[PDB]
Design a protein around this ligand. Sequence first.
Ligand SMILES: C=C(/N=C/c1c(COP(=O)(O)O)cnc(C)c1O)C(=O)O
Ligand SMILES: C=C(/N=C/c1c(COP(=O)(O)O)cnc(C)c1O)C(=O)O
Lengths: 333, 334
Amino acid sequence: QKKMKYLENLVGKTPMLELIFDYKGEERRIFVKNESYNLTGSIKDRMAFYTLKKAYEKNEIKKGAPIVEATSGNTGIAFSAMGAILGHPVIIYMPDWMSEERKSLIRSFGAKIILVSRKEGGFLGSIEKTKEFAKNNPDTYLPSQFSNLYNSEAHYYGIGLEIVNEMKSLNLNIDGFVAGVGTGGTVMGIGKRIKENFSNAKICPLEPLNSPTLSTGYKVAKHRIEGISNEFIPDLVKLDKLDNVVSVDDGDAIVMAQKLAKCGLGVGISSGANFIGALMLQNKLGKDSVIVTVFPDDNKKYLSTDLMREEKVKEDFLSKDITLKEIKNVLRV
Amino acid sequence: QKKMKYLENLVGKTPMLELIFDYKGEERRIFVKNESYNLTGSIKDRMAFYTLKKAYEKNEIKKGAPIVEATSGNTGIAFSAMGAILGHPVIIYMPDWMSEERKSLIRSFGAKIILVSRKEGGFLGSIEKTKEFAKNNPDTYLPSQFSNLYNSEAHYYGIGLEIVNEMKSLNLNIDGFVAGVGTGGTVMGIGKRIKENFSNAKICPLEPLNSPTLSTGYKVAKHRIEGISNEFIPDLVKLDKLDNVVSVDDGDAIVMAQKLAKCGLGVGISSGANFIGALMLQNKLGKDSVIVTVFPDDNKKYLSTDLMREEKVKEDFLSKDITLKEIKNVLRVI
Ligand SMILES: C=C(/N=C/c1c(COP(=O)(O)O)cnc(C)c1O)C(=O)O
Ligand SMILES: C=C(/N=C/c1c(COP(=O)(O)O)cnc(C)c1O)C(=O)O
């Protein structure tokens, strides 16, 4: 309680960057939150902390109860660290094709990690195994990130608020916001906050072009944008209450992430995707529209992946016409 | 200059943690700066930013000039990122037995990474190659971290000042400070700041027991505490102006780092070493003495190392009598 007050100093309050770049070849800018500046290096720390703090406040978790979750990586890492801080055993189910770094990290935080193959049902299968564990261990706390409102609320109260306060400090109206969807907590929570302040802002969820599950409603394929598009549309995301889906090719996302690293911003693959997405929305709203996005994590968990290999440029990539020019401002509140 | 003012928001202002633990039935606490909360994830971001900012101010670097450095990893990473932001090519020479993650990261930031074997002279060899590059290429900027006062100054003006302000806000006098030595910038700079505010504080440099270069003045051996004890005593560190050397076994450092990760603090190997060193100093000064240290980076670059394997506990390890109890406070002045 008092504890929860000081433990919040481990999450959030991250830099907002103004990134200037040339696009075929007009001067453009985009605003981005750098979420590596967090306990375990991702935006998910804000959500795990908020989720457990509220669960404590509402008596939904007992002391020493296991926390059990299914993850693409970061949320598992986040609950493993914060659970260990708060004295909980943590058990994480994760698909076996997520980066090796994610598995090692979860184990380093003292959690039990159970990998789940395509054969055992992947993401939906991971989720079912968490529920089977809860049935067989009735003290279990299930954060239920793919459906729990605490997830979107974390970002309404945390990062979304920082974003509205920071843009207001620059006397800029927010015209749009883009984020890749895994659970949708990011887009929904930030979206809610932004729209209460700017009722015409466009809030766009993002998907891989290779696995366009949101825009089609059903299509699922392999893609390399780790963390988003986890083989189903999560209950938390409400596509009818968001603006149009933005779709980015996973190679375009990679190239963009590589370029961001060569201007000093070592980001994960979904950060590259978000950057491209923000540009796509800016292209629709006007070259000077004020678009915000987020960089969910750094590049450290992606050294084993195609982020570190040469990616073939295709004719429809936006990245090929982008030259990053400068970090034009950094705010930290 | 206006640029340097806003770019500083990418470094520093990191959490100070109060960590409570049991050591032989006594309740102990130790204060630690969590330096993962930085541009590239390490304390070295503060130093690279400071070094280049001052170099710019004093006209010691030209626009587009190459920044060339020899590193155990983090400082190379830090200069690579900050150099890229400021429009500089970066060239890094690094021994080939540093973690693979370090090499990939430096490249990811667009720097040229040249690896240097034990046969080619290791760290001193890496340093010589930076100087040969500068002699061949006359507008080369050499941050020269093993000897440049800007390095210790970074920490005098940055992290050392945060530490003094934070401990003063808790009404606590600082009795000691411990940090592993690579360049010595951390210990010298923080030490200077702490001693100006607490003239009786002990400032102790730390080394690996397995490669006790500081306390012997000569011995060099293989050890796994990446980032410290880089095969020589750096000119920057002044052992005669510091308090006694603290030596930690690299297995003991590993176990301590593993334990920290199991209480939610995913830290590098030198962070484990520093925690043990703080305890050793506390043991000498008094169970209640106020000891401060730093955790230079997270565990992400160490997934390929013994940090992720089972370490054999030896009888002389301090880690084996430590039980972490809780994160008792976190301060953050942003
Ligand atoms: C679903 C998860 N992650 C989402 C994620 C996302 C998508 O954010 P939301 O899950 O809040 O939609 C974007 N980028 C990265 C690196 C991510 O790790 C998870 O870690 O379980
Ligand atoms: C010599 C360097 N590293 C220092 C370092 C140190 C030693 O810090 P000082 O250089 O300030 O002594 C401790 N821990 C870690 C993880 C480090 O990377 C360098 O990164 O090149």
